[PDB]
Amino acid sequence: QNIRNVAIVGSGQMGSGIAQVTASSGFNVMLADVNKKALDRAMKAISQSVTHLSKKQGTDKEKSDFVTLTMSRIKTCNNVSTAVADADLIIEAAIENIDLKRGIFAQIEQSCKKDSILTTNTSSFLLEDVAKGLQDKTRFGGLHFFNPVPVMKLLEVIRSDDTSDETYATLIKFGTAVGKTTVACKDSPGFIVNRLLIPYFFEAARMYERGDASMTDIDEAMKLGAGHPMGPFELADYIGLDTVKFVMDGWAAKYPEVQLFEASPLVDKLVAEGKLGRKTGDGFYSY
Amino acid sequence: MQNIRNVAIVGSGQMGSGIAQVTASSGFNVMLADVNKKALDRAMKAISQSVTHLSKTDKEKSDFVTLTMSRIKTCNNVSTAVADADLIIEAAIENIDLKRGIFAQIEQSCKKDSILTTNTSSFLLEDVAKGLQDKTRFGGLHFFNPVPVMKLLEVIRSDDTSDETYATLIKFGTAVGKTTVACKDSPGFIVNRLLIPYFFEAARMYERGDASMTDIDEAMKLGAGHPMGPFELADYIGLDTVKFVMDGWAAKYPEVQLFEASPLVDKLVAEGKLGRKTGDGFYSY
């Protein structure tokens, strides 16, 4: 009932993944990015993915109508203020840089409707910190989707210390309407999934640095013994060694009493060499 | 193998008969030993059923089942069980006194060059082997349940395990169809050492009031692709087991903040709610 029009700021992988599922679920989407070329690449990829996905779901015509109708609900705009002026729900999905996210929320709030809900997709920062400059924080919250968004069912919905119950309940309801399985978390570093997987990866690295077991043995053991789809070093390569490094460095300094948070000489050495994992074709492993 | 032809296994619980099964199927002779005849007859029946099932050529298959089962003999006395054994695997209840008693019995009767191993995940090999005269011939074979289906074998050396003993163990692990990984006698080896503290981190998250228990579970299943979530997984290991393990780590490494006990876990264990085995834990079964 309350949300019919969604604006999404950021047309990188997660932003356009969000626009894809939001539009497929029947909402109108406004996709904003000042980078006009990224905006174009994103629209093409949404189109290719929605066409591709439509195949599995009635008749041939019936598939092709779905595609056209879905795409018709996605519009683009190169200006953040213009794009958010009339949205009920606004989702920031920009890279993990806190000052950039703040800058963007400053611009959103100069232009958005009073009763509109504002969300961030971040996992690297606290909602309280992203939201620090806002006039109304009772309408701000977190929608942490997982890449690739059209494939992953999970959605972490996060309340800061100010999110109203009204805002929260609407977020949970939006998550469910876009086909997600929501789980509720508070503004705590790493929410549920990172707060647990990242220190687990750091523990595997520590075990390796002690010389207790080899790197590929550890990975094999977790895959075969715990039935995980990836072993922890692969998982790190997949998240990015620069992300895991930055998140852990952040926690270490912010919670100084938490012994579990600590940097790893081995992770730092790889990042210092620019072996950042899958994304650069080299991390713990090569690709 | 050239060296290993006879394997004795003591304990006919789930792990011991799974071991007996994959060992016999790989073409070794197995003696399975337990003082309790009911347990043994139960194990022999489970094994033949598991072998029949997995076998599914219509004679060719009957013959495999028969030949496989012909390579397993049973025995109600530790000393008779080990008399001709090249390798002995102890797969008893996680009770250190009990394990040590079995090794005092093996040692009275086993061959002079036979290899001795425990399957334990609850105790340091240095503790299990403390009474032994030749620690150079001793090591760990930590299989995973259900053994006929789980590929992983943790092969553990203590401080005294000889290079030759360790090489025979890795070679044996591979011969019975497993993927071996190498570990030292460090607490929890590889899997428990990573999983058990991850489970405590989850219980601590929950105890902090940050998220609910079923959301934490659903998050790890859907977000990380784990087959079970941490609370579910604790219930499956048994909470008394994960409590006991983590208690021992805490006692030994009192400066390691990661090993702190959880009140929640203590409460459930105090009440006898031990997870899947008492049909209660974090969830009801």
Contact B165, B136 (CB under 8 A): yes
- Is residue A283 classed exposed, middle or buried when 0-12, 13-18 and 19+ CB atoms within 10 A define those classes? buried
Q: Which domains does chain B have, with CATH numbers?
A: 1-191 (3.40.50.720), 195-281 (1.10.1040.10)
d(CA B68, CA A132): 69
d(CA A216, CA A285): 9
Contact B183 A227 (CB under 8 A): no
Closest chain B residue to the Cα of A186, Cα to Cα? B210
Chain A residues whose beta carbon lies within 8 Å of the beta carbon of residue B224: 193, 197, 228-229
Contact B168, B136 (CB under 8 A): no
Closest chain B residue to the Cα of A235, Cα to Cα? B224
Residue B112 corresponds to which tokens in the numbers above? 């002079």
Q: A238-244 long-range CB contacts below 8 Å, 24 or more apart?
A: A238/A277, A238/A278, A239/A201, A239/A277, A240/A276, A240/A277, A240/A278, A240/A279, A241/A267, A241/A270, A241/A271, A241/A275, A241/A276, A241/A277, A241/A283, A241/A284, A242/A271, A242/A276, A242/A277, A243/A96, A243/A124, A244/A198, A244/A201, A244/A202
Contact A183, A154 (CB under 8 A): yes
Contact A68, A79 (CB under 8 A): no
The closest of B200, B214, B196 to B263, measured between CA atoms, is B200
Residue A196 corresponds to which tokens in the numbers above? 């647990």
Question: Which one-letter amino acid corresponds to residue A100?
Answer: L
| Min Cα–Cα distance to chain B from A278, Å | 17
The closest of A206, A204, A229, A228 to A217, measured between CA atoms, is A204
d(CA B254, CA B263): 17
Chain B residues whose beta carbon lies within 8 Å of the beta carbon of residue A221: 152, 154, 181, 190-191
| Min Cα–Cα distance to chain A from B36, Å | 30
d(CA B54, CA B71): 17
Contact A192 B215 (CB under 8 A): yes
Contact B43, B17 (CB under 8 A): yes
DSSP A262: -
Q: How was this structure determined?
A: X-ray
- B6-10/B87-90 β-pairing: parallel
| Min Cα–Cα distance to chain B from A234, Å | 12
Distances (CA, A) of B143 to A152, B2, B23: 33, 23, 12
Chain B residues whose beta carbon lies within 8 Å of the beta carbon of residue A204: 194
Question: Which of B156, B178, B210, B226 to probe by mutation at the A interface, max A CB count within 10 Å?
Answer: B210
Q: Cβ of A246 under 8 Å from any chain B Cβ? A: no
Contact A192 B219 (CB under 8 A): yes
- Is residue A57 classed exposed, middle or buried when 0-12, 13-18 and 19+ CB atoms within 10 A define those classes? exposed
The closest of B247, B239, B240, B217 to B229, measured between CA atoms, is B217
Query: Kind and range of the H or E element at A119?
Result: strand A117-120
Chain B residues whose beta carbon lies within 8 Å of the beta carbon of residue A199: 198, 201
Contact A220 B184 (CB under 8 A): no
List all residues 6 or more positions away from A17 whose beta carbon is below 8 Å from its beta carbon: A145, A147, A148, A149, A150
Question: Which one-letter amino acid corresponds to residue A220?
Answer: E
Closest chain A residue to the Cα of B216, Cα to Cα? A192
**A241 in helix, strand or coil?**
helix
**A155 in helix, strand or coil?**
strand
Q: Where are the alpha helices (DSSP H) in chain A?
A: 13-24, 36-54, 60-72, 80-84, 98-109, 127-130, 165-177, 193-210, 215-226, 232-239, 241-254, 265-272
List all residues 6 or more positions away from A255 whose beta carbon is below 8 Å from its beta carbon: A189, A261
| Min Cα–Cα distance to chain B from A184, Å | 6
Residue B140 corresponds to which tokens in the numbers above? 């760990």
Q: What does the angle CA A179 – CA A183 – CA A189 come to, to the nearest 5 degrees? A: 130
Q: What does the angle CA B119 – CA B125 – CA B127 come to, to the nearest 5 degrees? A: 120
The closest of B217, B200, B176 to B262, measured between CA atoms, is B200
List all residues 6 or more positions away from B219 whose beta carbon is below 8 Å from its beta carbon: A154, A156, A183, A192, A193, A196, B211, B229
List all residues 6 or more positions away from A136 whose beta carbon is below 8 Å from its beta carbon: A109, A114
Q: In what order do the strands lie in the sheet with A140-145?
A: A74-77, A28-32, A5-9, A89-92, A117-120, A140-145, A154-159, A181-186
Contact A216, B181 (CB under 8 A): no
Partner residue facing B257 (CB), from A181, A228, A259? A259
Q: Is A264 a catalytic residue?
A: no
Q: Is A144 a catalytic residue?
A: yes
Query: Kind and range of the H or E element at B272?
Result: none
Catalytic residues of B: 121, 142, 154, 192
DSSP A189: T
Residue B189 corresponds to which tokens in the numbers above? 């080896």
Contact B186 A221 (CB under 8 A): no
User: How big is chain A by its Cα radius of gyration, in Å?
Assistant: 20
Q: What is the resolution of this structure in A?
A: 2.2
Contact B11, B136 (CB under 8 A): no
Residue A92 corresponds to which tokens in the numbers above? 């920031």
Residue with tokens 């929501």: A182
Contact A277, A251 (CB under 8 A): no
- Is residue B211 classed exposed, middle or buried when 0-12, 13-18 and 19+ CB atoms within 10 A define those classes? buried
Contact B72, B86 (CB under 8 A): no
Contact B148, B50 (CB under 8 A): yes
d(CA A173, CA A167): 10
Contact A156 B182 (CB under 8 A): no
Q: What is the number of CB-based contacts under 8 A between chain A and chain B?
A: 132
d(CA B165, CA B3): 11
**C-alpha neighbours within 13 Å on the C-beta side of residue B37:** 0
- Facing residues of A144 across strands? A156
The closest of A74, A57, A75 to A66, measured between CA atoms, is A57
Contact B194 A200 (CB under 8 A): yes
Contact B43, B32 (CB under 8 A): yes
Contact B107, B132 (CB under 8 A): yes
- Facing residues of B90 across strands? B10, B118
Chain B residues whose beta carbon lies within 8 Å of the beta carbon of residue A224: 144, 150-152, 179
Strand residue runs (E) in chain B: 6-10, 29-33, 72-75, 87-90, 115-118, 138-142, 152-157, 179-184
Query: Kind and range of the H or E element at A227?
Result: none
Query: Kind and range of the H or E element at B213?
Result: helix B213-224
User: How big is chain B by its Cα radius of gyration, in Å?
Assistant: 20
**B154 in helix, strand or coil?**
strand
Contact A192 B256 (CB under 8 A): no
